[PDB]
Structures are given as structure tokens and as C-alpha cells.
């Protein structure tokens, strides 16, 4: 039969916004396929049907990324880094939608395919972070070792992708979007663990593996798994501030090179300016 | 001082 040519691509551009539909059979997360029909024996035989099988995989990841969204903060901020990035993906979506509603449009199947092509590479590196992210959720006893090895694979992904590229810093910032935001609740417990003396660790999952023991003679026991000296400076300081609350006393990217271990070696004196000033008070 | 350490990191990125 005849389906609408140059309008089914505006109707997949439809699907990519509102993700569950009837022109495209994305029934589940594992299988996302499209079937329109075979179209007629003149005027674009099968090329357009080959292009729809490509974008079937590109609506597949956004259905996977939305299925990851449900309604620690580290697992929630890693989820909101996905969603805060979506409005930068949804702004172009309204641009090409504004172009085709405005007559004349002067676009077709193929001349739009290079406009979303820089976005096409940006959405596939989104797939690699989240596919290497969740791999041990159907296994049980995930709690801290899943958090530790998905932060590890996030760090494994930023070593593989930023350090090899650097011709475009727009994706260099993008892999830093996924890093600086997940580490921020993993930071704000450390701020609470020093200047307030107490920390928050939930019971269903676990984080940095700091826990206070219930007896008074026991100080602090580090959980065994079943920069690191700067983390030991957090351990002794939060022990010492737990003591102190018990005591009653009285431009261009290529010149900025590169990138995340320089910012981390800025955070360690930021830890340091409290690790150096606590031990003076002890 | 949570985002403040990251704000100085982004300030050091523009000055690097």
C-alpha cells in the first residue's frame, strides 16, 4: 500500500517526542522495530524503508533512557543528568518541527539526515554510558558494589572518550555533565560528615562505606567490599569532628588540557583546606 | 560548599 512519503519521516519525528505509538512497534525495551509497508514501484522503492530501519535503533535508546526514569541521591542525580540533558535534545526537535510546519519547507528525507547527525553521535555515547551503567541490577545484593562499579565504568567511559577526541569540546563538556553532577551528592555527604560531624547512609543501599559503630569505645569501622589518600583524610577528619561534637571545649579548550584530573587535583586542596584546618584545631 | 568547590573548578577551567 501507499503510505505518506516525506511525511512518515515527520511522523517518526513525531514518535521521537511522545514515545509510545502505533506507526512504530516499540512494544518493549529489548525490541524496537518499525513496519510501515512496501511502497510503490516508482519514486523511492526501498531506500526510505532502509532509513526507517536505521532510526528504529535511534528511537530505541530514548525508549531505554525513559524506561530508566522512575518516580541514594547519587542514583537520582545520575538519573537527573539524563533528564537535564534532554531539554537540549528537545530544543532542536522543535526547530525542525517549526521548519516543516512553515511553508515552504525545502527539506526532504535525506537533507534532514545530516542535521541530526551531530546529534546522532551524541545520542549513541548516551547509550554507552547507561548500557555499561546498568548490568548488575537483575543480579541481587547490588547495593554498594553496583554503585562503585557504575561510577567506575562512568570513569572508564570518560577516559576512553574525552582523551581520544578533543577536536570538539561540545561533547567534552557532555561527558563532564555526567560526571560533575553524580559526584555532587557524593560530595555533600562529605561536607556534612565534617562541619556537622554526622553522616547519612541509607539501609537498603550503601555509599562511600563510612559507618559509625554503636559503642562509645569503638570509633569507626570501614566496610569491606564483598584520590584514595585524600579519602583517608576525610576518614580521620570526620572521626575527629565526631570527637569534637562529643568534647565540650571552652577561554580555549586546547590550552585547558585535559581535563578531569586537573579539576580533581583542584578538589583535593578544597578537601585539603579543611583537612589542614581541622588538624590545627584538634 | 558543595557546588562551591565545583564553581571554583569551572572558574579554573576558564583560567587554565
Amino acid at each position: 500500500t501507499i503510505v505518506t512519503e516525506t511525511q512518515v519521516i515527520r511522523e517518526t519525528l513525531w514518535l521521537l517526542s511522545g514515545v509510545k505509538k502505533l506507526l512504530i512497534f516499540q512494544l518493549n525495551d529489548g525490541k524496537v522495530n518499525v513496519r510501515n509497508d512496501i511502497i510503490v514501484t516508482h519514486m523511492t522503492q526501498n531506500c526510505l524503508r532502509s532509513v526507517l530501519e536505521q532510526i528504529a535503533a535511534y528511537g530505541q535508546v530514548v525508549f531505554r533512557l525513559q524506561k530508566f526514569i522512575d518516580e541514594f541521591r547519587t542514583y537520582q542525580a545520575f538519573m537527573w543528568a539524563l533528564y537535564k540533558y534532554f531539554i537540549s535534545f528537545k530544543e532542536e526537535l522543535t526547530e525542525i518541527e517549526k521548519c516543516i510546519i512553515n511553508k515552504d519547507e525545502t527539506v526532504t528525507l535525506a537533507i534532514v539526515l545530516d542535521k541530526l547527525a551531530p546529534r546522532l553521535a551524541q545520542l549513541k555515547v548516551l547509550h554507552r554510558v547507561f548500557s555499561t551503567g546498568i548490568a548488575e541490577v537483575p543480579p541481587d545484593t547490588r547495593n554498594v558494589v553496583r554503585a562503585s562499579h557504575l561510577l567506575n565504568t562512568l570513569y572508564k567511559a570518560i577516559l576512553d572518550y574525552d582523551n581520544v577526541g578533543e577536536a570538539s569540546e561540545q561533547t567534552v563538556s557532555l561527558l563532564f555533565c555526567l560526571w560533575v553532577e553524580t559526584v555532587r551528592p557524593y560530595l555533600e555527604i562529605v561536607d556534612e560528615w565534617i562541619v556537622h560531624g554526622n553522616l547519612f547512609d541509607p539501609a537498603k543501599e550503601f555509599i562511600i562505606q563510612r559507618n559509625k559503630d554503636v559503642p562509645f569505645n569503638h570509633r569507626d569501622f570501614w566496610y569491606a567490599t564483598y584520590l584514595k589518600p585524600v579519602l583517608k583524610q576525610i576518614i580521620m577528619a570526620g572521626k575527629s569532628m565526631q570527637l569534637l561534637k562529643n568534647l565540650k571545649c571552652r577561554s580555549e579548550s586546547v590550552t585547558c588540557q585535559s581535563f578531569e584530573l586537573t579539576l580533581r587535583s583542584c578538589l583535593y586542596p578544597h578537601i585539603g583546606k579543611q583537612y589542614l584546618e581541622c588538624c590545627g584545631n584538634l | 560548599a558543595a557546588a562551591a568547590a565545583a564553581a571554583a573548578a569551572a572558574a579554573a577551567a576558564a583560567a587554565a
Binding site: 513525531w14 517526542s17 526514569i69 541521591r73 542525580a77 531539554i87 528537545k90 517549526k98 | -
Partner: protein, 175 residues
């Protein structure tokens, strides 16, 4: 159909989107001038107007169980509809500068509300299923503001801050 969707978003009924009051909906899409794709997004756009009238019933029950912190929680919730309703009037001048713009920008503003409106709806549903009364709404919202979602964690801290002010009233008058 610019005005039909801002006003399906405010929560009032129609006869294309037939609505009785405050709980029930029939979609009624035998419509000729919308596409089968475009009614699916109106169901996506109605789900952000459904929880907005699941919200005014929580107002009129408490304003106009019992407790002095139930309506202290009400002037927390009016602040979360206030940039919502501020966004409702900025869409109005969008329909006057050019009344030919289609619905995807209105879809775009409501994907921004897509992670604020269910995330507070799961809060009030967890509130009403424990049958909470008194200070322990303030502890329920405190472990709800224990969560992330950085726009939403400030929002459940603003609802925390206003009923902490009624706590702040109490030990001021008691002393």
C-alpha cells in the same frame, strides 16, 4: 488549536476531552482535525493537568483530617503552582504574537513540568496512604527532601521551610 491545549492544561472539562470533576476522564477521540499521533500527546498533555486538579481538591479540603500543619503544607504547595501558572500566561502572549505556531513548543514546556508534577504526586499519595497527622508530615517531607532531583529537592525544601516556620512560631510563643 492553540487555546484548546492551554485550557485542557488548566483542568477544566470539555466535550472533546469530557471530564466530570476532579477524578475521571474520557478521551473521546473520534476527531477529524487531529492525527492519531496528535491525540497520543494530548493524553501526554492531559496527565499533567490530571494531577493539577488532584491538587486543588487537596486545597479545598484543607482551605476554605485536620491539623495546624495541613494548611501550613498548603502554602507550601501554592508556591509550586506559582511558576506553573506563571508559565501559563507566558504561553498566552505566544499565541498572540503569531497564532499559527503548532503544539510542540507547548509539549516542550510540559516536558519541563514532566519531572516536577509526578514527583510531587508520588509525595502526596505516600502522604495520604499512611494517614499522617501533625508533625509527621514534616518528617515525611524531610525524607522526601532527602531525595535528589535538584529542582524538586528545592521545592520539597520550600514546602519544608514554610511549615518549619509554623514550628518556628510555636517555640517563639512558648518562650
Amino acid at each position: 488549536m492553540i487555546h484548546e491545549l492551554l485550557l485542557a492544561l488548566s483542568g477544566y472539562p470539555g466535550s472533546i476531552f469530557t471530564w466530570n470533576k476532579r477524578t475521571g476522564l474520557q478521551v473521546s477521540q473520534d476527531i477529524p482535525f487531529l492525527h492519531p499521533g496528535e491525540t497520543s500527546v494530548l493524553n501526554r498533555l492531559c496527565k499533567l493537568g490530571t494531577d493539577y486538579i488532584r491538587f486543588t481538591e487537596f486545597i479545598e479540603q484543607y482551605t476554605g483530617l485536620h491539623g495546624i500543619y495541613l494548611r501550613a503544607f498548603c502554602r507550601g504547595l501554592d508556591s509550586i503552582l506559582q511558576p506553573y501558572r506563571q508559565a501559563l500566561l507566558d504561553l498566552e502572549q505566544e499565541f498572540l504574537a503569531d497564532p499559527h505556531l503548532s503544539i510542540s513548543h507547548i509539549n516542550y514546556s510540559l516536558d519541563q513540568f514532566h519531572l516536577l508534577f509526578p514527583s510531587i504526586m508520588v509525595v502526596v499519595e505516600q502522604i495520604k496512604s499512611q494517614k499522617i497527622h501533625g508533625c509527621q508530615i514534616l518528617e515525611t517531607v524531610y525524607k522526601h527532601s532527602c531525595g535528589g532531583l535538584p529542582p524538586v529537592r528545592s521545592a520539597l525544601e520550600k514546602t519544608l521551610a514554610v511549615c518549619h516556620g509554623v514550628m518556628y512560631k510555636q517555640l517563639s510563643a512558648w518562650m
